Each structure stands twice: as structure tokens, then as C-alpha cells.
Amino acid sequence: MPTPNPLPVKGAGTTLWVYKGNGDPYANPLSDVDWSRLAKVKDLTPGELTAESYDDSYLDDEDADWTATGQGQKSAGDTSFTLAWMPGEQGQQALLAWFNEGDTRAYKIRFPNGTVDVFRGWVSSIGKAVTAKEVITRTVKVTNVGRPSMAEDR
Amino acid sequence: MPTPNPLPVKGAGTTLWVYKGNGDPYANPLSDVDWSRLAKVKDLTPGELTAESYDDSYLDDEDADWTATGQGQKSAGDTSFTLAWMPGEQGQQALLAWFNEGDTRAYKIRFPNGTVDVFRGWVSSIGKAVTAKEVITRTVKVTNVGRPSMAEDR
Amino acid sequence: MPTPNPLPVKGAGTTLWVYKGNGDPYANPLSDVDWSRLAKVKDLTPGELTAESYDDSYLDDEDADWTATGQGQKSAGDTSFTLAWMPGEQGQQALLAWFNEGDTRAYKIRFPNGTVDVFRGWVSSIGKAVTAKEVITRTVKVTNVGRPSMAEDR
Amino acid sequence: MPTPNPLPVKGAGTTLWVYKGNGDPYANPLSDVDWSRLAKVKDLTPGELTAESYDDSYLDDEDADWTATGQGQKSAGDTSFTLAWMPGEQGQQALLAWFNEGDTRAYKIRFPNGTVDVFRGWVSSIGKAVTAKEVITRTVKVTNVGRPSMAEDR
Amino acid sequence: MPTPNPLPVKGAGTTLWVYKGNGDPYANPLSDVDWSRLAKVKDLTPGELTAESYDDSYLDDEDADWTATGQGQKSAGDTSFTLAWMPGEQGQQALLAWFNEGDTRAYKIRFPNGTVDVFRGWVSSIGKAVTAKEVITRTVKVTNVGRPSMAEDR
Amino acid sequence: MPTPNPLPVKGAGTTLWVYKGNGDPYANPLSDVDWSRLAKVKDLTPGELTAESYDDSYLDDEDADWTATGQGQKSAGDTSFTLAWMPGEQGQQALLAWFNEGDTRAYKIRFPNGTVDVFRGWVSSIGKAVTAKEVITRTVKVTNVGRPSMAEDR
């Protein structure tokens, strides 16, 4: 039960948070003193940090048999999470205020370990799913603006 | 049974309505005094509110390692619902009058909660499905013209 | 058994017809006095009435946050039906005469209700399927030329 | 058992033939006096007779609400059949002679009815499938050059 | 058991070989006096001999209703086989020598019949698959340079 | 149990390593004196060594019936491995240091045999998967810069 960082952990217990609007979100992310919680999370796919290949081959080089490339312009991907549709909840009202405002906010993912994943982004997709025998779900996707504060930066 | 907004709800009981043609559809959407009902709904997929990424990178900036973007020109998606084919019903006759007229009308989705979802759009697709052992179904898709009155605007 | 238009119906009993070549197919479609029948129908997918979105955004407008569009140039889709391969039947001989002539003819779909669906189009695809244990099937697809006489125009 | 053209038939018994090289293949196709047989047919998909839509809308016309098109440049599709790999058979040797020569030959499909399907085309694909527990199969595809002699031209 | 060419055969027993580097690979392919063997073959998909359609329609022709084409620039496809990963085997060392040299070599497929399939090509893909409970597999794909010596040329 | 190179082996026991930063990674790859280990590997797909086809057909040649090509500009593919998410592990911290630095490092795959696979590349993708009943997984993909030291170069 005591959270081991060196040991693998199950995903059960992951929580989401959104910054309430103070300064310096990346400083002290392990305190929830100013983070609203998005309860009732069904599933969550974090962003995929990709990178564009940059071509590094000249005409003058001698070894033209194998492709030579280098990393360039890394980009944080999209984070997609599905919640239970609760319109009266303050979190979801703040979420669509975020959508209709267009600003980039800082959202945190708190894992069962003593580690957090802080990203800054703007929401780019909001949808719903209505089924007779299932709870109404709200699917949200956020596009990041770069420079994430990964958990292993501590 | 009393409709809790803060609590998650099942999708069973969702209904559809179309504005009969008075003024100000977004004002007082919780009264059905001027909304015709589209009965016998098989399934319903509401619109997906998406947004186009806007590039915000200049040559003069110093941090060119991570992509920086911002929300731009948000768009409401398509709403697709399937009904049971009832040509004599006034609702479906009004629906194909809507299709053959081309105007943009206001349609409402009433959830089992005390909340409504009002959109304005024009129908862009109408089809049928004929099967020996199943009821004839009419599939309809509506493209929205923007500025939806989401349920959490209250 | 008496055909209720206001009530939903099962698809069993749908029939197909082709105009024998008199005038005004859209007038009095509920009489089969001049319509040949295409018997032995396996399955039938009617046309999908779609529409192209027309852009309505100017530079001068103030609200450039949400996409504004309008319906434009509606088009009837393709109708695809599969019959049992009967080369000696007059209907299928007339069907390939239709294919090899290129003219646009009026075909009717008669539902179990007291309603009909009349379209005008030209056949654009004719194929076969040969299997050891199944009857030989002839698949036909017709592209419409517009202005269908839907059932709810009565 | 006596072959009824007006009645539907099962696909079992379909055979393939290739013209040995006399004149006028379309004349008298119901005699096998000069047609070699391709025995051991696993499956066979005949050609799909498609047609390209030709645009018929002018600026001067009044009805610009519905798309108006017309048939144009009909094309016979590809016929794909799989045989059992028998290199010593005269039929398959003639088939790869056909492939390596490039000429367009006339091949006939004889259905269990008293009807035949004669096409003229050139083979465009020849492959194999090697599996431990299955017979080696040779898959062949032929592209047609147009004007097929369908069975219902009699 | 005696290999019948006119009769269909099962695929079990197919073997692969690579030319050791003498002259005239297409002459006498039924002798393994100078062919190294690639043992432990899991599966093998031979090349697909395709052909590009060449347009033969002029403006002057009278029959412009059906597409007329002709075979042009036939091409042998890719041959893809998977072996068991045996780095110490001389065959696989020769195979990656082939890959890192770039030359086009002649490889033979020996079927359970008394027939062989000789192709000339260069390897264009080499990969691996590591699974806990399965043997490590090496997948290889070879692109041919044309003019195969099919088995029925005898 | 004694590792046979000539004999096929199961994939169980494959390990991953990253160079700690000395010189000449390709020299003596069978010693782990300066290689950090990436423990808890779920699955691993090594790179696929592909090659681009180079056209070798001139107008002057006589044989224009079959495509003639030759190997050109071979490229090592992407290597994708999934680990158990252990942020406190030195290996994963070094891995995201690698990602945020952009340099190309040498990573080794040690098979159950006495053979190693050394590649040089830069990481281009890092993602996560959060599930309630499964361990949190970190998926990593590395793009190679060419000239791999395959196991059969010994």
C-alpha cells in the first residue's frame, strides 16, 4: 500500500485535476491546495510525446547507404479522458468554461504512486454518448502546448 | 427517480424535439409549449464540439523545441439519430419538410435529468434500412451552425 | 395487418418495380398498371439523400468563432438491391436492357404500408456472386438523378 | 435437374473455358468444340460491369438544387478465379502462355443453367498460396477489354 | 507419393534455396549442386506477377462506350518468407550478406512436385519477432527484377 | 539450456540495455560492463531493416517488358518496446533524459542465445496506458540512424 516509485503499480486510483488559476503550476505539483478535481473518471489515455524526424544528409557526405536523421521539434500529444456526465458538478461546468474561453490551462494526473503528471493545454474536443443501459458519458480531449512536467523530473 | 444533476444517470429516457417556429429558442428551453416530439428513437449520437488548432510559432521566439498552438474556430459537429419509420407521423413529415426547405431549425435533446441540450442546425442526411425481420428505420443526420446552448449553461 | 402509416412496421414484404415506359411516373404511384416487378429480392438498401455544406462566412462578420454553413445542392444517393439470378425473367432482361441503353428510368419501392418510394435514375453497377451452396445472386446499384418522390409527399 | 432459366439455381457446377484460337468467339458460345477447360476451380468472382458518371449540369439550367448525371463509358471489371496448382495440365500452361504473350483472349463461364458468359480480356495477375495442410492454389485475375456477351443476350 | 504434375498437391514439403554464385541460374534448376538451403521455413508467400493496364483509346475510334485496354510492363511481385532465427546457420549469414551487399541473386522454391520456381531479386526487408512462448522468427521479403522462370516452362 | 546458435530458440529471456556513455559501442557488445538495464519488459518489436527500390530502366534498353530495379538507401526501422512504469528506476529516468536531450544513443537487445543486437538511434515516441486492473505501462519507440551491428556479424 505505501507507494513504491521503483516498483510497478496498478492503474487503479488515478485521479485528474485542473488548476484553479493561481501562478506557477509546475512549482509544487504534489499539493492539491488549488486544484479542482474531475471525479467519476471512466478511462484516461495520457498524451503521447512524439518527435519529428529531421533530415541530416548532405551531398558531400561519404556514407550515403543508410539514412541519417536526428530528433527535431518534439511535441506533446493529446490527452483523452471520459467522465460520467454530471452537468451540476462544478468541475464539468469549469471544463466547458475552459472550452468556451479558449485559454490554455494546467491539468494534473495523480497516479497511485507519489508522482504527478502536469500538462498545459487547451481542450479541442467534447462529446457525449447516450445509451439505454449505460450511464451517459462525456468524452474530452485536450491538446497540449508543450514542455510537460513529467513525473520523473521529481 | 428525482433527477439528480450532480449524480450520474443512465441514458434511458432521452427524448428529441424540434422547434415549431416561434422566436428565441434558447430562451426557456425547459418548456415544451412549442416543441414537437420525434417519438420512437432507436439510438442517438449527439454532436461533437471540436476545434481547429491555430499555429502560434514565430521565427523570433527562442523556444522552438516544442509545438505551441492555440484554440481557434470551434465548431459543433453532426448529430445523428435513428427513428422508427412512421410516414404518417407529423414529426417525420415536418422533418422532411425541414430537409426540402433547407432552413436551419432548433432541435432539443431532453435527458432523464432536468437538463436540455439545444442546437441549431440543418439536416444533411436522410436514409432508410429495410430488413425482413427488423422494423424499417430512418436515419437522420443534422449539421449544426454553431453556438450550442449546452445543458450546463443552465 | 391493415397497413398503419402512423405505426412502425417490419420490412418484410417490400417489393420493387420498374416503369414500363408511359408518361408521368410521379403521378399516381400507388397503381401497378404499368410497372414491371423485380421478383426474388434478397436485400435492398435505398438511396441516402445527402447534401453538400455551403460556406457562409465573410471577412466582415463579427462572430468568427463558430463555423456557419448552409445546405447546398442536395443529392439522392445510390440504391443497391440484390436479386436471385433468373436470366429468363423478363424483369432482369429489361434491367440489362436498361444498363446497355443508358437511359434514366423510374423505379418504385413498395413498402408493406400503403406508401411508395419513387426514384428516377440510371444503373451504374451490375455484378454476380457464384457460390457452391448458395443461389446465384445478381447485385445491382442505381444512381439517382435527383428530385425523389418520397412516401410522405403522399 | 433440367436447367430452368426462369428459375434460380445454385452455383455448384460452374465451369471455365478458354478459346483455343479460332474466329468469332461470340458466335455460338454454347458449343465446346474449340474451348479448353480449366479444371479444379476453387472459387470464381466474375467481372463487375461498372460505369462512370458523366456530369450534365450547365450554368443556364434553372433546377440547380439536385445533381443531374448520366451514364458514360461503361467498363467491364476484373474476373478473379482460383484453381488447384497443376503445372502439368495443358490449361495452366496455356494460361501462363497467355500471361507471357500479352494478347487478349476470350474466356467463357458455363453456369449450371443452359447459359454462358463470354468475356474478352488479358490476364493481369497470377499468384500462389503455399500452406502446409492445404492444396497449393493458383489465383488468377483477368482484366476485360469491354463489350461482354452476357448470358441474357441469348 | 510419386510426384504427379497433373494432379493437385499439398504444400507440405516446400523448400527454399539461394544460388551460391555460379553462372546461368535458369539453366538446369532441378539440380541442387550449387544451391544453399534455407532450412526451418515457417511460411512462404511467393511473388504475385502483376501487370499495368495500358490505355488504348483514341479520339478517332467509333466505339467509345466501353473501356479498351491492353497489358503493359508486367512485373514480378515480392516474395515473403519467415524462417526460424538461427544466426549461426550459414544460410542466414549469407542472407544478410546479400542484404548488406545489394546485389540481385537467384532464389529457388522447390515444391513437393518435380517442379521448381526460380526468381532473381534483391532483398528489401528483414525483420524479427520476439515473443515469450514462441521461437524467434526472421521475416524476409525479396523484390524481383523480372523475367521469372516459372515451373511450367519446364 | 546451453545457448545453441544453430538451433532455434524461444524468445523468453530477451533483455534490453542502453549504453552508459563510453566509446565504441559496436566493439565488444557481449560485455555488460557499461550498459544499464531496462528491467520489466512486457513486449518488444525490433526494427525492420527495409530498403527503397531504385529504378534502373533506360529508354535504350531492349527488354522493356519486365520491371528492373535495384536496392538503394537501406534504412533501419523503428524499435518499439513496452516496459512497466517505474518512475524511480534509474533506467527510465535515463530514458526520458535521452528523450529530452535529443542525442542518439546505442541500445542493445540480448537474446537467450549468445548473440546481441546493437542499434544506434534516438527515441521518437513515449506514451502511457492507464487501466484499472492492469499495471501502468510505458511504451517507447526509437528511430535508428543506420548501420546496425546485427548478431550474425559476430
Residue numbers in the entry:
A (entry chain B), B (entry chain E), C (entry chain F), D (entry chain D), E (entry chain C), F (entry chain A): 1 to 154
Article excerpt on this structure:
Here we used *de novo* model building to identify a protein contaminant within a recombinantly-expressed protein sample as the helical tail of the YDC107 bacteriophage. All top 100 hits pointed to the *Escherichia coli* phage tail protein, specifically phage YDC107 – an unclassified *Ravinvirus* from a *Caudioviricetes* class. Structural analysis revealed that the central part of the phage tail has a C6 symmetry, however the overall symmetry of each segment is C3 due to dimerization of a flexible domain.
